[PDB]
Swiss-Prot record, chain B:
GO terms for cellular component: T=13 icosahedral viral capsid; viral capsid. This is Major capsid protein. Belongs to the Tevenvirinae major capsid protein family. Major capsid protein that self-associates to form hexamers, building most of the capsid in association with pentons made of the capsid vertex protein and one dodecamer of the portal protein. The major capsid protein self-associates to form 160 hexamers, building most of the T=13 laevo capsid. Folding of major capsid protein requires the assistance of two chaperones, the host chaperone groL acting with the phage encoded gp23-specific chaperone, gp31. The capsid also contains two nonessential outer capsid proteins, Hoc and Soc, which decorate the capsid surface. Homohexamer. Interacts with the portal protein. Interacts with the capsid vertex protein that forms pentamers. Interacts with hoc; one hoc molecule associates with each capsid hexamer. Interacts with soc; this interaction reinforces the capsid structure. A total of 960 subunits of the major capsid protein forms the 160 hexamers. The keyword Manganese does not apply. Keywords: Capsid protein, Late protein, T=13 icosahedral capsid protein, Virion. The gene is gp23. The keyword Transferase does not apply.
Curated annotation (Swiss-Prot), chain C:
The gene is 24. Proteolytic cleavage at the N-terminus by the prohead core protein protease gives rise to the mature capsid vertex protein. Capsid protein that self-associates to form pentons, building the capsid in association with hexamers of the major capsid protein and one dodecamer of the portal protein. The capsid vertex protein self-associates to form 11 pentons, building the T=13 laevo capsid in association with 160 hexamers of the major capsid protein. This is Capsid vertex protein. It comes from Enterobacteria phage T4. Coiled coil: none annotated. The chain holds residues 162 to 214 of 427 of the full protein. Homopentamer. Interacts with the portal protein. Interacts with the major capsid protein that forms 160 hexamers. It comes from the Viruses. Belongs to the Tevenvirinae capsid vertex family. The lineage of its organism: Viruses, Duplodnaviria, Heunggongvirae, Uroviricota, Caudoviricetes.
Length: 381, 113, 53
């Protein structure tokens, strides 16, 4: 449908198509695909895991029974012991930190299980299992529709404006549609994004830059946002690729030197971006939601496929415009439909659960992205 | 013999058995098939229109009879097999909305044979 | 001065491109799946190599 395709081209250009992953459908439902792993380091092979089980959990009472040449693992990372009694000289009570110290002081050594070809082939050793699984799910294509191209005396007005009006009105209608769609995307993204939480929520409470807290510069938020990106790096094999925030949350609040107003409009920045941050990421802005929040997360691809995302979008065409003369009024109806969903496997142990849930059911997917986080922000209204 | 036993195969001493399709037409009206796995003893009458959307039941053979091949070195034996991905469905009449509800078909148990 | 030394070539094998019921899903996603999967698998390999370094 070339006329709808032309409207598609002229309408999807108006939404934040890159803050979600984009896939497409041709079905009444969209088959979506995505990638997930539940714990990141070294090999994921059975041989690896078994050797790890067979050496030690590095408990506090056992860390000193280790000597030169021994292996140990902690938090699934295998380390070799350099010289005797590693940690003998480390008073640190938090074993994880003691380990970090031991690595630096060369008491232990990050250990690689890489080996000769012969070792592997001779023993008929096991092999790395997959880190990530590839999931598939489907959701219904959902829609919205408008009766907004009002005509009658309006036709007369449009005739007066007849030099532009035919196309102008369809483009305008498409624009308001795009606006609600963009907002719909944001609602889903907002919902799925995990609540960023550190020590009882972002330093033991949601960041608060209110008058009674820290009406500073907005620096403390910029710092927190940058940390949100760190969180993404910690939990997933990706760096943040986008950020969206309200004006009061960051689009304006961080404009104290840690936000750039699109100095350049064509390099590493979409046409729909409000700007970008000093810590990168094209920056988007919602402007609608009562939340006044910040979202940090990642969209990523393998070749042409946007397989990674918290939310996936899959439009379905064969942007329909219909002209109907109710009585005296040949108004223009506009219909747009698409699938939009979160990866349901983030709320499932396996397919038996995935098969009874819906990635489009945002009452379940709420807070379960893992490819995005949200910062609640209290502000100096 | 309107319901056919494929009598020519019998005549020729089992030149085939063709035991996979509808036998023929009872009353000259109903194409009749054999449930080769019937559990008790029964019949079901059903309707099918010329339109694929007028069957009351749907079978959509995505990926049919795709072969598998391989070999297992433990005894170096061949691996061969088949897979399908067909899917089914019915006129919704609202599986939970299927049981005992689909007007296109009526099932009767038969005794005394 | 220029030094020389010889170090054994070590290796790491993955058996991760699972296909079977998975093949069927990959076939469903056959539009991209053949090469997609190899690139995905290559990506995990690259990750482990990079981490080793």
């Amino acid at each position: 449908r070339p006329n709808l395709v032309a409207l598609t081209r002229a309408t999807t250009k108006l939404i934040y198509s890159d803050i979600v992953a984009t896939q497409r459908t041709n079905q009444p439902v969209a088959a979506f695909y995505g990638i997930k792993y539940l714990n990141g380091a070294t090999y994921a092979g059975e041989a690896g895991y078994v050797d790890r089980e067979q050496i030690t959990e590095l408990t506090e009472e056992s860390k000193l029974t280790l000597n030169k040449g021994d292996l140990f693992k902690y938090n699934n990372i295998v380390y070799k012991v350099l010289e005797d009694t590693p940690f003998a000289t480390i008073e640190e009570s938090d074993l994880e930190l003691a380990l970090q110290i031991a690595i630096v002081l060369l008491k232990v050594r990050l250990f690689s299980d890489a080996a000769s070809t012969s070792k592997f082939e001779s023993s008929d050793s096991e092999i790395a299992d997959a880190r990530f699984q590839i999931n598939k799910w489907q959701t219904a294509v959902k829609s919205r529709k408008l009766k907004t191209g009002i005509t009658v005396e309006l036709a007369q007005d449009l005739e007066a404006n007849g030099f532009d009006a035919p196309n102008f009105l369809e483009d305008l209608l498409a624009t308001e549609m795009a606006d609600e769609i963009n907002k719909d995307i944001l609602q889903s993204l907002i919902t799925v994004s995990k609540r960023y939480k550190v020590t009882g929520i972002t330093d033991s409470g949601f960041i608060d830059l209110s008058y009674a807290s820290a009406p500073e510069a907005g620096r403390s938020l910029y710092r927190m946002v940058c940390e949100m990106v760190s969180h993404i790096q910690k939990e997933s094999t990706y760096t943040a690729t986008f950020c969206v925030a309200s004006a009061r949350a960051a689009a304006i609040l961080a404009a104290s030197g840690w936000l750039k107003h699109k100095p350049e409009d064509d390099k590493y920045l979409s046409q729909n971006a409000y700007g970008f941050l000093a810590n990168g990421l094209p920056l988007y802005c919602d402007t609608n939601s009562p939340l006044d929040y910040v979202i940090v997360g990642v969209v990523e691809n393998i070749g042409e496929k946007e397989i990674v995302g918290s939310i996936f979008y899959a439009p379905y065409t064969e942007f329909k415009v219909v002209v109907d003369p109710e009585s005296l009024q040949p108004s223009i109806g506009l219909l747009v439909r698409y699938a939009l969903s979160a990866n349901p496997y983030t709320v499932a142990k396996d397919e038996k659960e995935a098969r009874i849930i819906d990635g489009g059911d945002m009452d379940k997917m709420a807070g379960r992205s893992d490819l995005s986080v949200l910062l609640g922000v209290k502000l100096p209204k | 013999g309107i319901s056919y036993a494929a009598q020519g195969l019998a005549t020729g001493f089992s030149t085939d058995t063709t035991k996979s399709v509808f036998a023929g037409v009872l009353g000259g009206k109903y194409r009749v098939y054999i449930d080769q796995y019937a559990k008790q003893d029964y019949f079901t009458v059903g309707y099918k229109g010329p339109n694929e959307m007028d069957a009351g039941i749907y079978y959509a053979p995505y990926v049919a009879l795709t072969p598998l091949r391989g070999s297992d070195p433990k005894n170096f034996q061949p691996v061969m097999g088949f897979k399908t991905r067909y899917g089914i469905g019915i006129n919704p009449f609202a599986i939970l909305n299927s049981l005992g509800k689909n007007a296109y078909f009526r099932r009767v148990y038969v005794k005394g044979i």
